[PDB]
Amino acid sequence: APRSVDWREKGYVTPVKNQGQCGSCWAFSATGALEGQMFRKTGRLISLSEQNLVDCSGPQGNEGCNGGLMDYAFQYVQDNGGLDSEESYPYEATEESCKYNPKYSVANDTGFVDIPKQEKALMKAVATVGPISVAIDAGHESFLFYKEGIYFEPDCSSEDMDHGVLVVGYGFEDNNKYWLVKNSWGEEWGMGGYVKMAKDRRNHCGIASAASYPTV
Numbered sequence: 001a002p003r004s005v006d007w008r009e010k011g012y013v014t015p016v017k018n019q020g021q022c023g024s025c026w027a028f029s030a031t032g033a034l035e036g037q038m039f040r041k042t043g044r045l046i047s048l049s050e051q052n053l054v055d056c057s058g059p060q061g062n063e064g065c066n067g068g069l070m071d072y073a074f075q076y077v078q079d080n081g082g083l084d085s086e087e088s089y090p091y092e093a094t095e096e097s098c099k100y101n102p103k104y105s106v107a108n109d110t111g112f113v114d115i116p117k118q119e120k121a122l123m124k125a126v127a128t129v130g131p132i133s134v135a136i137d138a139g140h141e142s143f144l145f146y147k148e149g150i151y152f153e154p155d156c157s158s159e160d161m162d163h164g165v166l167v168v169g170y171g172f173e174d175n176n177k178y179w180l181v182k183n184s185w186g187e188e189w190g191m192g193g194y195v196k197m198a199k200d201r202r203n204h205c206g207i208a209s210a211a212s213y214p215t216v
């Protein structure tokens, strides 16, 4: 694979968003992934409604501001015939009743792909597909106060993930490789909203344990 990849450069990635005081990280990872694949398809980068996901994907298994899965959001989009743009269906950081307007929809998917549970398979996907939804163990306070550099937490779990985020690329700066990850905690956290997560250090924080992307 290429030694470095950055989808931000190719226009696949919207600016950093802020989930606020609602546990909807899964909705940001999913829109992030769909934004990428839609752009790969249409050449138009259009921001997407996390609120549409939060309010409307209960049937598929999601729990609004209490958590959910990226794949359940991707299944919702396939079930629903589409997803509203962020412009039309704005983010409120609260669970309210559903409001999908089929006319205001700018995206769709034909399903999703679950990537094999290794960093090699993740790298293959990131290099060839675009941005990838991933689960990480973000439970450690080191992650909360992350500012710069390659994030390495010795106590991280490869199997116990609690935060959905988006891999937009990877690179290198011993133990010098990283995944470039877009978070949804706004631009004042980490590196303008991003974190470099240790790569090829035995699936650090579980970054390859539940990686997926939508098919468009």
Ligand SMILES: *C(=N)C1(NC(=O)[C@@H]2C[C@@H](S(=O)(=O)c3ccccc3Cl)CN2C(=O)C2(c3ccc(C)cc3)CC2)CC1
Residues within 6 Å of the ligand: 019, 022, 023, 024, 025, 026, 061, 062, 063, 065, 066, 067, 068, 069, 070, 071, 134, 135, 136, 161, 162, 163, 164, 165, 210
């Ligand atoms: C985000 N603000 C928040 N975390 C989650 O919603 C997080 C998102 C997924 S995941 O951690 O990426 C994950 C974990 C295991 C397997 C697949 C995936 Cl995609 C689920 N999340 C969770 O925190 C858990 C969860 C699982 C299912 C449901 C319905 C709700 C939560 C606890 C695993 C909310 C803090």
